[PDB]
């Protein structure tokens, strides 16, 4: 996250880290048992990170649950983006408290203008290089439909949008791919991909969660 604030230890508490030997994605509890994630952050040996604020540092509210399955959206194209969205089952099924908590899937999608929130343990600089420990947090508005596609010409789905400011100097970033966009308490959007980051006229571009209530609600359904 460049551009954003230290988000506090634990109130964010369905925001996870995806590890395998080291934090490489976010994502977000969105039940005891799964994670949402992005597709493009797939890999074997996942062990979910749930309770997390410094990720180098056992600080006491951690749970490390290995991942059992994942599901990549079937219609995932990794040229595009398009559906960049997977779902992660844990062995065993997370305790939850104020701490870790789930977060809701939405009814109905977002609209332009509405403030979100997005965390992550990403890169905070738009140059260079420097990974934060502790979580970082931002507030951005969705944008509109066209400003996102005037942005990214031919490249922005009905299965994306953007979020951010088109001044630059805040977005999400590389590390923070798989996290949590939550707009009113509700799940609305996935860290997925960006020109550079914190770009002028080149905000985020986010995975319209809303698209997916019932691929994620029948998939969990069914296994
Ligand atoms: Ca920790």
Not at 61 to 76: D, G
Not at 118 to 145: E, F, H, Q, R
Request: charged share 10%; glycine share 12%.
């Amino acid at each position: 996250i460049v551009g954003g604030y230290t988000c506090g230890a634990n109130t964010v508490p369905y925001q996870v880290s995806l590890n395998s030997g080291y934090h490489f994605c976010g994502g977000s509890l969105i039940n005891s048992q799964w994670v949402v994630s992005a597709a493009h952050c797939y890999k074997s040996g996942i062990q979910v990170r749930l309770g997390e604020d410094n990720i180098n540092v056992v600080e006491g509210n951690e749970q490390f649950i290995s991942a059992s399955k994942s599901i990549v959206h079937p219609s995932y194209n990794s040229n595009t983006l398009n559906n960049d969205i997977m779902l992660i089952k844990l062995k065993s099924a997370a305790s939850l408290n104020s701490r870790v908590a789930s977060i809701s899937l939405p009814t109905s999608c977002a609209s332009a203008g509405t403030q979100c929130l997005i965390s992550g343990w990403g890169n905070t600089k738009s140059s260079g290089t420097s990974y934060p420990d502790v979580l970082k947090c931002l507030k951005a508005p969705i944008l509109s439909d066209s400003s996102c596609k005037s942005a990214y010409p031919g490249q922005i789905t009905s299965n994306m949008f953007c979020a951010g400011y088109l001044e630059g100097g805040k977005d999400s970033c590389q590390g923070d791919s798989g996290g949590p966009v939550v707009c009113s308490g509700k799940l609305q959007g996935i860290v997925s991909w960006g020109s550079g980051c914190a770009q002028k006229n080149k905000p985020g571009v986010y995975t319209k969660v809303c698209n997916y209530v019932s691929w994620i609600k029948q998939t969990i359904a069914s296994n």
